[PDB]
Amino acid sequence: KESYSIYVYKVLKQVHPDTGISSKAMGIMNSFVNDIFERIAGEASRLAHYNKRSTITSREIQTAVRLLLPGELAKHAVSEGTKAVTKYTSA
Amino acid sequence: KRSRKESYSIYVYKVLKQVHPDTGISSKAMGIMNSFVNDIFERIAGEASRLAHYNKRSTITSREIQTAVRLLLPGELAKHAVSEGTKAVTKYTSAK
Amino acid sequence: RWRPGTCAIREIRKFQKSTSLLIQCAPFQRLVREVSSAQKEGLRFQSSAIMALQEATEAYIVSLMADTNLACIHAKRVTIQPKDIQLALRLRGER
Amino acid sequence: RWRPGTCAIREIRKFQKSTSLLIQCAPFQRLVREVSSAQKEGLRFQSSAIMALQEATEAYIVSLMADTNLACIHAKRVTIQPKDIQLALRLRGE
Amino acid sequence: RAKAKTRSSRAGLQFPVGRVHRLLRKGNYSERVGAGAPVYLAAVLEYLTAEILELAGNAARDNKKTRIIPRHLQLAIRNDEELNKLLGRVTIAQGGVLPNIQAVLLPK
Amino acid sequence: KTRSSRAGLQFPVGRVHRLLRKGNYSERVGAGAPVYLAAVLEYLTAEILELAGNAARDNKKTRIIPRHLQLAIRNDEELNKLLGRVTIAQGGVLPNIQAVLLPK
Amino acid sequence: RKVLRDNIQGITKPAIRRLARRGGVKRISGLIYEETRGVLKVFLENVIRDAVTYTEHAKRKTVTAMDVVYALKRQGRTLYGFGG
Amino acid sequence: NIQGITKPAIRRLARRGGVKRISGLIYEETRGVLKVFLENVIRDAVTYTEHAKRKTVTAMDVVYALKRQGRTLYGFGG
DNA sequence: ATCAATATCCACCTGCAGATTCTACCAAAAGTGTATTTGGAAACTGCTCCATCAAAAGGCATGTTCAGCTGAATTCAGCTGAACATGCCTTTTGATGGAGCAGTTTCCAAATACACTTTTGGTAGAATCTGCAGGTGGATATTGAT
DNA sequence: ATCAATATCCACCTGCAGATTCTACCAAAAGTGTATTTGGAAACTGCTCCATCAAAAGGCATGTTCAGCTGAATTCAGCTGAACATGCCTTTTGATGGAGCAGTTTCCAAATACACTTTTGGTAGAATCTGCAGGTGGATATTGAT
């Protein structure tokens, strides 16, 4: 059975190299990641159906992020997403 | 350059003549009906998809529709709904 | 001369019986285009689409008025006050 | 001797600072199994599953208490009354 | 061959089981879709539409009109407990509201 | 060499790709969509972890517990707007006593 | 298009009075109208934000009614009567 | 057995909510509302389990039952 | 209780904007016949769950006092509703320009399906840290008397 | 406002038992590389639908008055709820036995997905009807003043 524990631990070592995290908080983190993934994927599927489109490109993810994140957060989120997409495509 | 699009208008009219043979219905109320049917269909199908995914199963049998109806409809609405659904399913399986 | 509150009570009956739009369509359409052009220049609207906005806003505000009036009845008054609206918005899980 | 409300206010700080379960676990499991057997007999429970119910019930009721207290502050009082609980549930869309 | 009777007739419904089947397949709910699911779902949809349409018809005739308009639908939904619990998060255009004045605001 | 490193992320783009395909969201799934989504998820997780870590510094502790997460979420505007319909086990609540109930 | 100015003046005081009378209110304080227009404008800004995002994703300059229905549904406010 | 939820426990829950003064008539409405919430949640959760053809109620069933009511809960698997 | 004065239902009539029915096509179900999955049945296998039992303890239930709080009763200044005169702007309706959709076709950049070959994160142990529960000592806050 | 005196937190230190962190391996995803389809982007274009634009009116908003009635402010008596002390028992914590399920694997009969070919019910106009909206007139019900 899969889980996001290791990647959350990697990000934690990125932003706080010395600090640890409890197991209960790890379960909180996994639950959060899955819930957010569910929100984004759901809005993306609905956006796909709304335009008689059968594929999901990163444009739909961008629009779903713009719809689900309120204001000050969506800008940073879109910036990091487009950054990752460009850095992945260019090389 | 004139197009076409499907809709539930005719079936809603059939049910209307079923329960009240004299009464008519306006076009706006018909649009209300279409939106309502589509909303309920979306709710039921969505809960059915979640029920399917929750058990590592990739198919949707009428069992999932029944349990979703039991989850989303409050009381006697769910009871009668399950009754009519089971009636229709048992009538369809016999292929008579 | 009508006593105060009587002409008001019988107003509630007419407006709770009717369904037509209680806001003039031209000023509501002016404001919608104001905000839409505030978010993006040169945007158009379907004639039906603006009707959708008016129904939703009217329904939202009507429900908010009913809940505010409930807050007033609970506070043992009849005159609604902004002290009551911010209570309703706080308990609706939206503010 | 402490004034009335003083021992209560400084209690509010205790419970708003702590996070442990505020309900005794034994009576809460007795009720859960009562209702569960009321809807279906012979059902078992994961130890983790019942802990989920206690957290959810505690959070729901705590939020309801805060909103009721807001209704009292608005009604210009401090003592919560059943007149206030039914107002909160009515404005909660419930 | 076997002369074709539609699935709606085999199930005894008014809603097309085939179209519901197509929406179930192409709707991105599950990869495969059973055979009794569209029958069951079309039956449920027919039942609920029959419910609200009967209520709206009676509410319309109580107003002495022979044609269902949105107001009749609003009255039919809001005067029932279960349907209102189902559609509490829904508003109906051209619908109006339920006539209800609190007893505190009435004359004495 | 992996897609996660090629994109500069910490979250596995392959896992997001598999979950997106097998999740019954759409018949076809683009190539940049899983990268984009994994990037957004990484950003938000980094946000909440930085906030919780800073709150743990304000509490002078070196291990993140649920209380730190609850305090970090409820003290922020955007995150609180995002998760208003969420409860956190072992979390507690924000210490707030109304001004009307205080002495003096 | 136009540098519009002061369209909130179009929401008249008696119009808000009528909306309140439909809501079942008997007596109204003068301070209500301000908060009313404020809440109305905030809600409108949210809904139009989401609708314009739907349109800009749809590669169009026109805001159809379905876009409004989606924008409302995102806020947990299903609306019937304009889906067709 | 719902009467087993003692008065001082309800007092503690209210004090966490920020309430200063509590009426005696509160406890009845309190236990009633709690009983309604518990009945709903257990109804949906037991339906989720009974659909999976099992006799044990896991925590994920509870999490789903709560999520259906618009009440996401983190800490037990989703 | 009466009585004048408005406001309100109820029915009726007619023209018409819209709902209904009738007809002619056509996209899509229905039917036939393969090819592919999959839920499910059988047999184990551990594994959490349930059921007792003891004991330490601290939370619960009871009862008593007392203070502050809430509901009742009163007053009144001011505010808001009803009215009326004034005038301003929102509604209907028609017509055009054209802009912006929809609809139609055509052709790749991208996605899918497989066949192998690596990489890895998941599971089960071995071996460290660190907030929890206390403890003092100091710093505040409360409560009561001058 | 001060001031002595508890009580109550707050700050810092401290040991340790329980989670925490670190290691050693592998089924199953993840990655690479072909053999193919395919959705969707690009380009026109047919054509609704939107946006202005005009203008009188008559319906409604605005501004001002006046009075009645409501919200705000005050007093206060009685009672309800908090605080506190008490003692008893219900809760937790630890430990066992074993039993009833979940969960894992394996192997098919049955159900469903595809690949094509006909048969229609459904849909979009054309051609018909037809309840409903306005507009009067009568008969009540409601409201306010004596």
Author numbering:
A (entry chain H): 34 to 124
B (entry chain D): 30 to 125
C (entry chain E): 34 to 128
D (entry chain A): 34 to 127
E (entry chain C): 11 to 118
F (entry chain G): 15 to 118
G (entry chain F): 19 to 102
H (entry chain B): 25 to 102
Pull verbatim passages from the article behind this deposition.
We performed nucleosome reconstitution by the salt-dialysis method, using purified LmaH3 and human histones H2A, H2B, and H4 in the presence of the palindromic α-satellite 146 bp DNA. We then determined the crystal structure of the LmaH3 nucleosome at 3.63 Å resolution. In the LmaH3 nucleosome, all of the histones are actually incorporated into the nucleosome, and the structure of LmaH3 in the nucleosome was similar to that of H3.1. In the crystal structure of the LmaH3 nucleosome, the LmaH3-specific amino acid residues, Trp35 and Gln57, which correspond to the H3.1 Tyr41 and Arg63 residues, are located near the DNA. In the LmaH3 nucleosome, the corresponding residue, Trp35, also interacts in the minor groove, but its hydrophobic interaction surface is different, as compared to the H3.1 Tyr41 surface. The side chain of the corresponding LmaH3 Gln57 residue has a neutral charge, suggesting that the interaction with the DNA is weakened in the LmaH3 nucleosome. The replacement of the Phe104 residue by the corresponding Met98 in the LmaH3 nucleosome may affect the interaction with H4, leading to the reduced stability of the nucleosome. Mutational analyses revealed that the specific LmaH3 Trp35, Gln57 and Met98 residues, which correspond to the H3.1 Tyr41, Arg63 and Phe104 residues, might be responsible for the instability of the LmaH3 nucleosome. Nucleosomes containing LmaH3 resisted the Mg2+-mediated compaction of the chromatin fiber.
Histone proteins, H2A, H2B, H3 and H4, assemble as a core complex called the nucleosome, which is the fundamental unit of the chromatin in eukaryotic cells. On the other hand, Leishmania histones are evolutionally diversified, and have 48–60% identity with human histones. LmaH3 (XP_001681421.1) consists of 130 amino acids, and shares 60% amino acid identity with human histone H3.1 (H3.1). In the present study, we found that the Leishmania histone H3, LmaH3, is incorporated into human chromatin in vivo, and formed nucleosomes with human histones in vitro, although Leishmania histone incorporation into infected cells has not been investigated.
